Amino acid sequence: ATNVKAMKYLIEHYFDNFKVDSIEIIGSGYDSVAYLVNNEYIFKTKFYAKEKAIYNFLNTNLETNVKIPNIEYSYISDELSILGYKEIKGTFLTPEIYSTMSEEEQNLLKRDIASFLRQMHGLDYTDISECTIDNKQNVLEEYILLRETIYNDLTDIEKDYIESFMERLNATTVFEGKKCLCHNDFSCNHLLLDGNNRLTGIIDFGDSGIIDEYCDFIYLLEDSEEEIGTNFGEDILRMYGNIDIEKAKEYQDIVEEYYPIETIVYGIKNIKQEFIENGRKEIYKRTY
Numbered sequence: 001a002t003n004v005k006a007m008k009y010l011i012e013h014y015f016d017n018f019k020v021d022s023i024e025i026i027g028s029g030y031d032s033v034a035y036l037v038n039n040e041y042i043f044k045t046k047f048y049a050k051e052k053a054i055y056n057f058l059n060t061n062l063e064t065n066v067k068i069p070n071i072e073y074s075y076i077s078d079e080l081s082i083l084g085y086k087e088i089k090g091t092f093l094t095p096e097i098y099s100t101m102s103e104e105e106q107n108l109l110k111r112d113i114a115s116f117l118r119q120m121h122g123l124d125y126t127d128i129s130e131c132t133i134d135n136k137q138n139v140l141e142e143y144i145l146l147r148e149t150i151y152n153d154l155t156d157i158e159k160d161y162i163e164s165f166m167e168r169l170n171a172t173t174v175f176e177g178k179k180c181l182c183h184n185d186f187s188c189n190h191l192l193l194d195g196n197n198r199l200t201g202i203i204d205f206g207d208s209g210i211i212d213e214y215c216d217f218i219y220l221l222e223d224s225e226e227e228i229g230t231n232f233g234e235d236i237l238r239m240y241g242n243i244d245i246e247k248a249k250e251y252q253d254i255v256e257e258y259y260p261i262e263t264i265v266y267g268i269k270n271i272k273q274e275f276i277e278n279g280r281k282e283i284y285k286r287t288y
């Protein structure tokens with residue numbers, strides 16, 4: 001409990017009347033830690049301005065019964081960011097849980113998801129218009145960073161994987177469609193169910209932005225151990241409606257192809273050799 005103690009100190013220091021009676025680590029990424037405090041509050045911390053701006057925009061503008069974080073505590077500085085909000089109660093959706101649900105239960109969950117996405121994507125985003133993300137341009141810039149750093153030391157197999165991806169990226173039309181506000185990390189580990197297996201809450205709008213509409217289906221369409229599966233995403237797309245399903249799948253496939261490169265780039269930017277090695281190894285796994 002050393003981490004817990006430092007974070008208890010920081011919370012009490014920056015939020016003057018707040019008393020920490022209990023505190024435990026509830027999740028962690030590679031450069032963030034999330035804490036459950038007093039069995040009631042979530043504090044996300046990092047060594048978060050946009051994320052806060054997004055919860056504020058959404059809590060003003062969304063009409064939905066699905067719960068999202070409502071920021072009550074914030075401290076934001078160059079060196080440290082903390083966001084605190086009341087824990088949304090529920091069970092996180094998993095493949096295992098989904099497989100035990102009746103067909104009707106599954107259908108209601110899919111409809112709840114489609115409905116939420118439709119409402120969010122339909123919001124007039126003028127008041128959040130600073131939060132724009134261009135994925136194609138971001139990729140080009142990450143490629144330039146590769147070229148400026150480690151590209152010349154990569155193997156021919158690694159180089160070909162990258163150049164083949166850039167060729168595909170250049171030819172695709174999937175970045176030319178509707179833009180809207182997306183969650184942009186819409187995976188089942190961010191989806192909470194209530195006791196009837198109905199969608200009750202959504203978390204982690206940390207990557208959210210004005211971006212391609214296709215983006216919020218990337219994980220719903222993913223075939224992996226962590227996600228439900230492609231059929232889940234297809235059905236949600238049909239319920240959501242007025243969207244080109246083949247292009248949504250093309251978008252997901254291109255993003256999936258990019259993953260190893262994204263991993264390499266993260267390692268370069270954050271000076272973490274482990275990630276550079278992991279992404280390069282994953283290129284070999286995918287090639288063979």
Ligand SMILES: Nc1nc2c(ncn2[C@@H]2O[C@H](COP(=O)(O)OP(=O)(O)NP(=O)(O)O)[C@@H](O)[C@H]2O)c(=O)[nH]1
Binds near residue numbers: 026029032088190205
């Ligand atoms: N049940 C519950 N758990 C929460 C809540 N908020 C966060 N969590 C838990 O804490 C984990 C981390 O929260 P999350 O917003 O995803 O943060 P992160 O993804 O680790 N950090 P970042 O989004 O900055 O990279 C979640 O996966 C979940 O376990 C909440 O409202 N309810």
Ligand SMILES: NC[C@@H]1CC[C@@H](N)[C@@H](O[C@H]2[C@H](O)[C@@H](O[C@H]3O[C@H](CO)[C@@H](O)[C@H](N)[C@H]3O)[C@H](N)C[C@@H]2N)O1
Binds near residue numbers: 186224227259262
């Ligand atoms: N762990 C192995 C899986 C296999 C499939 C691959 N597509 C990826 O899939 C996960 C994907 O990475 C997850 O997003 C993480 O990563 C993103 C960037 O990479 C971050 O911006 C994001 N905020 C972070 O939480 C997603 N939430 C759930 C997906 N199952 O890894």
Ligand SMILES: [Cl-]
Binds near residue numbers: 273276277
């Ligand atoms: Cl390496």
Ligand SMILES: [Mg+2]
Binds near residue numbers: 204
């Ligand atoms: Mg998360």
Ligand SMILES: [Mg+2]
Binds near residue numbers: 185204207
């Ligand atoms: Mg996140």
